[PDB]
Amino acid sequence: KVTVTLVDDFDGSGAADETVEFGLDGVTYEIDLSTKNATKLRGDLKQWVAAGRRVG
Amino acid sequence: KVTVTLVDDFDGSGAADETVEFGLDGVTYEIDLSTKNATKLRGDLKQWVAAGRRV
């Protein structure tokens, strides 16, 4: 059979639960992550977002 | 005197050297940072950038 899986991009340990969008230096990225890893990414960026300013 | 300073947004303590653009969950941000803190931010994102895909 042909099996198609949405795999977690960060640790590859299991399936992803969501696709998270983020950005750096004018480049936009997407990443498929478990709920746990999406939570880690959001946590890593939390204080930076709090210190930054919204722009278009 | 009117004193003007470009202040690091993250630590409020150092002089800012550059503005970094970044984004999370569909919102885009700018932040003025010392060279050291800009490197810290880019470092925090390094593992995620490497694992993710453009657009």
Author numbering:
A (entry chain B): 4 to 59
B (entry chain A): 4 to 58
Reproduce passages from the article.
Lsr2 from M. tuberculosis is a small, basic protein (Mr = 12.1 kDa, pI = 10) that is highly conserved in mycobacteria and related actinobacteria. Lsr2 is a DNA-binding protein that likely influences the organization of bacterial chromatin and gene regulation by binding to AT-rich segments of DNA. The Lsr2 dimerization domain forms a compact homodimeric α/β structure. The dimer forms a 4-stranded anti-parallel β-sheet such that the helices are arranged in an antiparallel fashion and are on the same side of the β-sheet.
Here, we report the structure of the N-terminal dimerization domain of Lsr2 solved by X-ray crystallography at 1.73 Å resolution using ab initio methods. Crystals grew from one of these constructs (Nterm2) after a few days but this was dependent on “maturation” of the protein sample (by some unknown process) over a long period of time. The structure in the monoclinic space group P21 was solved at 1.8 Å using the latest version of the ARCIMBOLDO program. A 14-residue long model polyalanine alpha-helix was used as the search fragment to arrive at the ab initio solution. We subsequently learned that these absent residues at the N-terminus had been cleaved by contaminating proteases in the case of the P21 crystals. The monoclinic crystal structure reveals a linear chain of dimers formed by crystallographic symmetry. The N-terminal end of each dimer forms a single ß-strand (ß0) that is then paired with the N-terminal strand of a neighboring dimer to form the linear oligomer chain. The oligomer is not only stabilized by interstrand H-bonds, but also by a network of polar interactions between Lys-4 (the new N-terminus after truncation) and its oligomeric neighbor.
